[PDB]
């Protein structure tokens, strides 16, 4: 079902990728695909880390909203299902 995601890479220079766009998800056909969003929230301000396709992950099953649940991490990470679902992201305090 999830074939495309919003793409973002802040570390694009060292990783030799594009900085932004749309990522088509490479599916092995026998597995679920998801989208993900990752960012830093150093006192209210958002510094986007990465956005892209995420492989078959039990944590992401049937999640339409990209919600980061890890409490007070250095980097927030969420995953979701559905095309471009990582367009919107939030964290659960």
């Amino acid at each position, epitope marked *: 079902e999830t074939r495309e995601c919003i793409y973002y890479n802040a570390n694009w220079e*060292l990783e030799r990728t594009n900085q932004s766009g749309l990522e088509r998800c*490479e599916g092995e056909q026998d597995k679920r695909l998801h989208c*993900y969003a*990752s960012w830093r929230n150093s006192s209210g301000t958002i510094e986007l880390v990465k956005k892209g396709c*995420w492989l078959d992950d*039990f*944590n992401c099953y049937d999640r339409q909203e990209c919600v980061a649940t*890890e409490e007070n991490p250095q980097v927030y990470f969420c995953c979701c299902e559905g095309n471009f679902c990582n367009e919107r992201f939030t964290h659960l305090p």
Partner: antibody
Amino acid sequence: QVQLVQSGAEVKKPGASVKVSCKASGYTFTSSYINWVRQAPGQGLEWMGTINPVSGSTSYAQKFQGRVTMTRDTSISTAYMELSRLRSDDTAVYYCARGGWFDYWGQGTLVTVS
Amino acid sequence: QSALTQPASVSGSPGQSITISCTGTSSDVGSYNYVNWYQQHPGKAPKLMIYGVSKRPSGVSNRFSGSKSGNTASLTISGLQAEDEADYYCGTFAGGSYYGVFGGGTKLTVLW
């Protein structure tokens, strides 16, 4: 095809540290977790922990809390597992495996603590 | 982190069916479709045979199937063959909110 290739066999003295590497190819390294597992001679599989290569977040098994460090270098699609204050019974084959389902496994790394 | 219990060993004859059990509780096996099975041949790395209780990856023989009843997940091997002789481990999904655990493993012997 999807492949995880680990660093070679290592021999360590008790009290030393070992760093095992896990090189991912045939898929986007940042599209899934890396899990670490070990297996002592003639014993079962033991989970060590997971790393999220996107965020750098880790979760360690209780047994290793305080002496295991998991890192990654996304520029070279490589995950690392460092185990400190080595003891004679840390002699094991250490594995990395892809994602939460451990769908592809590295060939394993024998670490002998003598 | 909760322990998963497997029998130490199971033996079978060629062509027979064998079932390996992985027992947890209602808070783990009984609540989540996240039990997986790994085959390990002598001197080799484990291989994923079944994931998510009953899902078979492509490449895995259709003689391998997985199921769950109550708090016990089961791996069934139909038409037992010599190459099935190995250690089998059950385990749960590991990552994010899920802490990894493996069962103690089961040594499967195929008696020729």
